[PDB]
Structure 1
Amino acid sequence: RECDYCGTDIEPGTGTMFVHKDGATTHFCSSKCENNADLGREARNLEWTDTAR
């Protein structure tokens, strides 16, 4: 699996899946990503993110 946020591979037996109100799903590899997301930031604008890279 791949983190729907930063893009790196999610270590199996790890991570959280957030279920949106509409039913959409978001797999996070860590708290760092979830939190950066809750701040309304987009992974593309964060230089440390594989996405952005």
Structure 2
Amino acid sequence: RECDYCGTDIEPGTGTMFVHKDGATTHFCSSKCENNADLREARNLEWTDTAR
């Protein structure tokens, strides 16, 4: 994928994946993805695998 989108990344040959309601999702990564993303609009996201 791309930490869902968070093109950064973090935590070994395992990692981990957060998640939201509605069969929707959020595979995941670092404390730079999280919080931010968990609170607005992905599009606008830069740094990473979006505003790449």
Taking structure 2 as the reference length, the TM-score comes to 0.56
Query: What CA distance in whole angstroms lies between the structure 1 residues aligned with 2:23 and 2:12?
Result: 23
Query: What CA distance in whole angstroms lies between the structure 1 residues aligned with 2:31 and 2:9?
Result: 15
Q: Deviations over 1:1-42 (max 9, x none)?
A: 421132346665353312322232211111221111122x33
- Larger mean CA deviation between 24-33 and 13-22 belongs to 13-22
Identity among equivalent positions (%) equals 100
- Give the root-mean-square deviation of aligned CA atoms: 2.6
**Stretches of 4+ aligned residues off by more than 3 angstroms:** 8-12
Stretches of structure 1 lacking an aligned partner (at least 5 in a row): none
Stretches of structure 2 lacking an aligned partner (at least 5 in a row): none
- Larger mean CA deviation between 1-10 and 42-51 belongs to 1-10
